[model samples]
Target: FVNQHLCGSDLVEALYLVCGERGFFYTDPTGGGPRRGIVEQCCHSICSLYQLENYCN
Candidate 1:
């Protein structure tokens, strides 16, 4: 479902972006995503990790 307009990034940039530990840990615990990390920059996507991972181990 991506097109040129949705083409906001290239693979190298994605690799670079994914490499940054910016918002991936927003759903941890005890003010993890709820009180601390969710409202910051680059991390709204972080909350989705909880839903996606579904408490996986």
Candidate 2:
């Protein structure tokens, strides 16, 4: 389940829009592999968006 009308809503919508509901590419670039960087990237992207595009590396 997801928390509607919350911070993650936009991200969920954006992801679905870019990819399909059942799409896998945008969901996770790792493709179920042993890749930690992709998870890190997802976190970074969410943080950046939450900060109004003012995130630092």
Candidate 3:
């Protein structure tokens, strides 16, 4: 479902833009272990689309 829109390099660049604009890898001071809200979901989607093992790291 995530990769349904963009694809190839366009999708990859879009993912990076989202990360920069939304702080996609920002950590929560409250806790950790994923599920930091919709942003976390976005990050996972990016990782899934790009096959990035540590895109959020």
Candidate 4:
């Protein structure tokens, strides 16, 4: 598992790579409640992939 050491554009790029390599469907899980948007969903996906907590808060 990864940590929260990465940030900013690097983090964005890492997420992009994860999404591209792993596919969006595999990266992002379902149900972020009714209020979850694309940004929230992406954040959740990235954090979850890296085993991070409170990263999007």
Candidate 5:
């Protein structure tokens, strides 16, 4: 999850969006509890999409 935490963002809105992404939804089925998407900045949470361009579609 290190790669997922690289950006700074509003904790309130960021979590709401990231969880909707596919890879992140499965990474932790429990929604990562209360600390999910609490990061340093906002960006694509699913590295699968970033690394594998096919996943972007």
Candidate 6:
């Protein structure tokens, strides 16, 4: 669970936001996958949101 409120639309930007001041994306401590690089993490997050957005429409 996030210790602070999380908000963002773009994957890259969101990660930046969290890394900066607003919030964060904690890595899976259980090792589901290695911590993702910035580009990969953001791209995946952004794309997934697009998928969700499309799914509703």
Question: Which 10 residues in a row give candidate 4 its minimum summed lDDT?
Answer: 48-57
C-alpha RMSD of candidate 2: 9.1
Off by over 4 Å in 4: 1-4, 21-49, 52-57
**Prediction 4 global C-alpha lDDT:** 0.40
lDDT of 6: 0.36
Q: Is candidate 5 or candidate 6 better by lDDT?
A: 6
> Which candidate leads the pack in lDDT?
3
**Model 5 alpha-carbon drift over 4 Å, by segment:** 1-9, 21-57
Candidate of highest TM-score = 4
The residue pairs in collision within model 1 are none
Candidate 3 structure quality by residue, lDDT tens digits, 1-57: 344333334433554565545443434535553333323444434444343223434
Candidate 1 ranges beyond 4 A from true positions: 1-9, 21-57
Question: What digit string (tens of lDDT, one per residue) describes model 4 on residues 1-57?
Answer: 353334434444555555554433222445543323333454444344443222222
RMSD of each: 11.9, 9.1, 9.3, 8.5, 8.6, 11.2
Candidate 5 lDDT, 1-57, residue by residue in tens: 234433323222333344445333212324433233333122434332233222111
Q: Which 10 residues in a row give candidate 2 its minimum summed lDDT?
A: 48-57
Query: How high a TM-score does candidate 3 get?
Result: 0.26
Q: Which residue pairs collide, candidate 4?
A: none
What overall lDDT, based on C-alpha atoms, would model 3 receive against the true structure? 0.41
Better of 1 and 3 by TM-score: 3
**C-alpha local distance difference test of each model:** 0.30, 0.34, 0.41, 0.40, 0.32, 0.36
For candidate 4, report its TM-score: 0.30
In model 5, which range of ten residues has the least summed lDDT? 48-57
- Cα deviation of 55, candidate 4, in Å: 9.3
Question: How large an RMSD does model 1 have?
Answer: 11.9
lDDT by residue for model 6 over 1-57, one digit each (tens)? 222222233433445443454345544324433434423344343334332222221
lDDT of 2 by residue, 5-48 (tens): 31334444444444444452333334542232333444433333
- 25: Cα error in model 5, Å: 12
List the candidates' TM-scores in order: 0.20, 0.27, 0.26, 0.30, 0.20, 0.24
Q: Which of 2 and 6 is ahead in lDDT?
A: 6
